[model samples]
Target: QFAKPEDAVKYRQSALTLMASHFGRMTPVVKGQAPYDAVQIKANVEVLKTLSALPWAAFGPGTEGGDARPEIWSDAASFKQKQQAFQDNIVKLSAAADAGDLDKLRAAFGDVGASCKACHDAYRKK
Candidate 1:
């Protein structure tokens, strides 16, 4: 949590972009079409963790700015819980990537996906 909501929004959006980019890079590695660059994989995981920690309220109530909904700020505790869960799961993803454990990496992807969905289900607009 930053002193300013704008700072949090900026941080969250930046992290989200980085996460998407790194995930795009890591996907081919997961598919066996390219060599897994552990550094990039780890980077993606770290960015995801950063994204998870962003203050949801910074973006405004609910899913504004392509968000799911205002209820997220409206339901603060659950939002924090979901964010914590996201951070925990991303740590696992990062570990899997560092280990180059493909099976765990693959499974971890879904786990990450579920975390996103869980938060979106309660927060995102559409």
Candidate 2:
């Protein structure tokens, strides 16, 4: 557990930044702008899966900071649903990446991005 709200803030921010970094790296590959290495995509997506599981618990009471909207805590049902959807898509993404199925990967990637945007639309301040 975080000993301070600041600790929670940094912890979530770091995890989310890494998540974005990893997710961003795969964008070109998904868009056909870069070469697809099954091995590489598989490895990166695995790391993303782990990162996706984080950040939620860090949003506990009084840990609010970053571009967070108050609804993250106030409307937890919606927040939890969005996070769950994101995680669900990540699982599909992992399978697609592991199978090296470009078609499946693209679809899953779209869903994941949509999930991120939906949550941010409602919960991120900026």
Candidate 3:
């Protein structure tokens, strides 16, 4: 539980940074820039699934600092819609990974990245 706005912001930032770290490990594999490793892919996907619900939980009142813009709270409905889309895409990506189908995983990975970009474009500061 975040007692302070700063705490919430910090928590969310940490979660997102960790999410990026896990997601980054899969980028080259998905892009065909590197060889795919099933073990690493599985581990990364599982970590993403575990971290997916965190940032949203940290977006309560007073938790509006860092790269997150005011639009996140001002345009609450839109932000939540984008967040839900990201979550959905993450789940899809996880499922694709669990299925162990490289083609499907690649497509799902792209969707997840697009979702992140979409939300970031709207809500995150440059």
Candidate 4:
């Protein structure tokens, strides 16, 4: 268990960073800038699906001291809704990748990106 709030904060930051890295690897493929590789896409999506659920649990009290805005805790309902949207998008992205359809993957990728941006825009400090 995380003994301190900062520990949770650090853990979530690290998890989100790793999640972004995996998402980055999929961007070029989704954009058609790189050759499509079903293997790579599936792998990255699996990682993202796993990482998607990690950060939210770490958003306990005092973990708000970082890039995460206090609104995450104060506006708890909205924050949870955003988190659910994000997780749903990640699942869609994974399903798209698993189906090995470029069009589906592209659309799902965009949805995932939009979900992330929406949450960040509202609950992340710039």
Best by TM-score: 2
Instruction: Report the C-alpha displacement of residue 62, candidate 3, in angstroms.
Output: 1.9
Ordered from best to worst TM-score, the candidate numbers read 2, 4, 3, 1
The superposed Cα distance between candidate 3 and the true structure at residue 98, in angstroms, equals: 0.8
Model 1 lDDT-worst window of ten: 59-68
Task: Please give the TM-score that candidate 4 achieves against the real structure.
Answer: 0.94
Instruction: In model 1, state the lDDT of residue 54.
Output: 56
> Which segments of candidate 4 are over 4 A away from where they belong?
none
What tens digits encode model 1's per-residue C-alpha lDDT throughout 58-115? 6554334444466766767887888888878888888897786778998888788788
lDDT of all predictions: 0.70, 0.92, 0.88, 0.87
lDDT of 4 by residue, 66-123 (tens): 7888888887898999999899998888899898888999999898899999998998
Model 4 has an lDDT value of 0.87
Give residue 86's error in model 2 in angstroms: 0.7
Runs in model 2 deviating more than 4 A are: none
List TM-score per model, in order: 0.72, 0.95, 0.92, 0.94
Model 4 poorest ten-residue lDDT run:
60-69
Per-residue lDDT of model 2, residues 22-115, tens digit only: 9989999999999999999999999999999999999998887878888898977888999998899899999999999999999999999998
